[PDB]
Design a protein around this nucleic acid. Sequence first.
RNA 1: UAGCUAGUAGGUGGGGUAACGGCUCACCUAGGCGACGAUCCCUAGCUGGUCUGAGAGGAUGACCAGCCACACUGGAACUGAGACACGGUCCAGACUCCUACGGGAGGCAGCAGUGGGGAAUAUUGCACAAUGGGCGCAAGCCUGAUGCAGCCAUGCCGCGUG
RNA 2: CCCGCAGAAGAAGCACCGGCUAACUCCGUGCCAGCAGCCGCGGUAAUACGGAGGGUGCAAGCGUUAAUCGGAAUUACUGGG
RNA 3: CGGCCGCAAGGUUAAAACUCAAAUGAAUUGACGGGGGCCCGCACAAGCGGUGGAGCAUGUGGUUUAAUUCGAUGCAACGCG
RNA 4: AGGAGGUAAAAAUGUAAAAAA
Lengths: 123, 66
Amino acid sequence: ATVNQLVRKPRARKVAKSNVPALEACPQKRGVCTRVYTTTPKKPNSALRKVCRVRLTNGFEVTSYIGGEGHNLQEHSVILIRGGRVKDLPGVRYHTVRGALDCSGVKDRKQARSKYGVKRPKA
Amino acid sequence: GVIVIKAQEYRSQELNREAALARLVAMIKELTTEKKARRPTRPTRASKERRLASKAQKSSVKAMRG
RNA sequence: UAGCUAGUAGGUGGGGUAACGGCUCACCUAGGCGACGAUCCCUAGCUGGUCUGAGAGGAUGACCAGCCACACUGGAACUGAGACACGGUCCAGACUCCUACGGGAGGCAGCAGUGGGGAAUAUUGCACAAUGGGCGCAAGCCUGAUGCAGCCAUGCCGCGUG
RNA sequence: CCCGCAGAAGAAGCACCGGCUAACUCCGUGCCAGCAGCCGCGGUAAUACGGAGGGUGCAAGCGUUAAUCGGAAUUACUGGG
RNA sequence: CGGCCGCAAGGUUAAAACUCAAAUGAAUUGACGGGGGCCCGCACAAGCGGUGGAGCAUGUGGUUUAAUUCGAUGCAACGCG
RNA sequence: AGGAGGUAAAAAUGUAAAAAA
């Protein structure tokens, strides 16, 4: 509407926001994975998810989500981080790829073996 | 750790002795017994209150495709 | 980000370059730029195009081609048709190597490769047969341009596992 | 490129099966442990969790994350209030 | 936050980080109102006689025990099964 | 039938004793 208002002030395109603020266009990043803990989600559900803070290689203390059940981390043992949210933890933006550089894929896991670092029993 | 306490205001030296004796007892006891730990606590009304939402919500979320 | 600029705006004359020009001095005029967005700050090589989209637009500029710019950092020239120069020279600095301590040497953002950073990205391969260039009367000589292979499912396309 | 031998030998996975969206049952755990792109699932019968078997999709690829556009006529000049 | 205006109180201009999957409008049906109107019931008013006071009977809670069987536990459990 | 004044009062929350770690 009002072309003259448009020729003075152009149609400003709203800035599209990203949801993985690690770094622009960085798929995965390595993380030291310091101080691991376990707390509880919000109102609708209730559990004790294994979650940790992650000191990144660019000095970013991001908060991630330790997946699965059988972990192998504590204060050290550098791993890998992938994006994604779980909505239950009020304030998480990062996931963790099990079967990482310093975290093994959990055993006694037969189905859903693409992720969670599950090796297919060749025998 | 070579503690040095100065007992000054009192013309009598022996009055300053007990003034230093008072400064001895309070200094060490305040550093002796610390805080009481072992917090936190487990939720109480979650067993009910949280489930209260689940009893009224599920009756509404049954869409039945449109 | 509201004013910006003082060889700065123009004039005259001399100097100057292959070439007109404050490109440079002497003197005169007091101007010129500015909301149609100047100075100032952040970001960025640009384009034919690429991806998507009904179209218009939106994002982008790896690969191929055109153009600009850079060569450890800054500056400055010289030879010459042309650079003010990747693999030439002079100076200063930073960082390494050689040393008889006097004094010198060097530049992979060329092809491979090493460390390193990183989520990640390949052999210290073979040969100038073809094509292109350079030089030469020609024959020829050199070329990690180029031509192929090694490695990778990275994508596309295709057959197979009857 | 062509020719001969050729024992089927030497060659099939991964995701998903609550709705969104093609695809189902049982056992184990009992809001604990976990799954999840969106709403959400689970209080001892869970088609949504873990596993088993059956099903579907795509295929030497398969899913996740990331980035762009589309859907977004939710920056609308075409094309909004 | 910075600029500007302001004696000051402040005003004007005008973000982002982070965060939820909503917030919101109008109308509809109920429900509710220490909102209004109409109407009914021992609701009250008008009285009669009790409970709660004492004893006893009987049921429950609690407590206790080797057990004090289970269940019922506002009105609508408690001389109940 | 219009009308005109007129006549009205205090009282909260829903783990609500049931926990500690």
